[PDB]
Amino acid sequence: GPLGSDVKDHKLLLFQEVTGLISTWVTSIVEEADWDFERALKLFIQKNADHEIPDLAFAGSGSSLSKADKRSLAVARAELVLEQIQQKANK
């Protein structure tokens, strides 16, 4: 459809905003999770624990947080959103 690419852009940015990952890993994880926001967050957390997310996958804004602290913040944000998704389902 003529709107499909704008929807895909949005789903990528949804995940990118939560995780703070560069677009390269946003594409990789979102596509592997078949474009599902919740599954992509879970997949990011699993890949992170398995040492499959390089330091350079974490976006920056100047050189500021270390790569280790960017990683911890990204995981924490993804885990909080997953909790919010579960809490919204329960209501």
Domain borders along the chain are: 4-90
Amino acid at 6: D
In order, the DSSP letters of 10-44 are: HHHHHHHHHH-B-HHHHHHHHHHTTT-HHHHHHHH
Q: State the CB neighbour count (10 A cutoff) for residue 67.
A: 13
Q: Are 28 and 54 in contact (CB under 8 A)?
A: no
Record the tokens describing residue 64, joined without a space. Answer: 């500021």
58 by DSSP, 3-state: which? Answer: strand
- Please state which architecture CATH assigns to domain 4-90: Orthogonal Bundle (1.10)
Question: Cα dihedral angle (79, 83, 88, 89), rounded to 10 degrees?
Answer: 100
CA distances to 15, 45, 65, 71, 80 from 68, rounded to whole Å, are: 20, 15, 8, 5, 18
Question: Residue length, the chain?
Answer: 91
Burial of 5 (0-12, 13-18, 19+ CB in 10 A): exposed
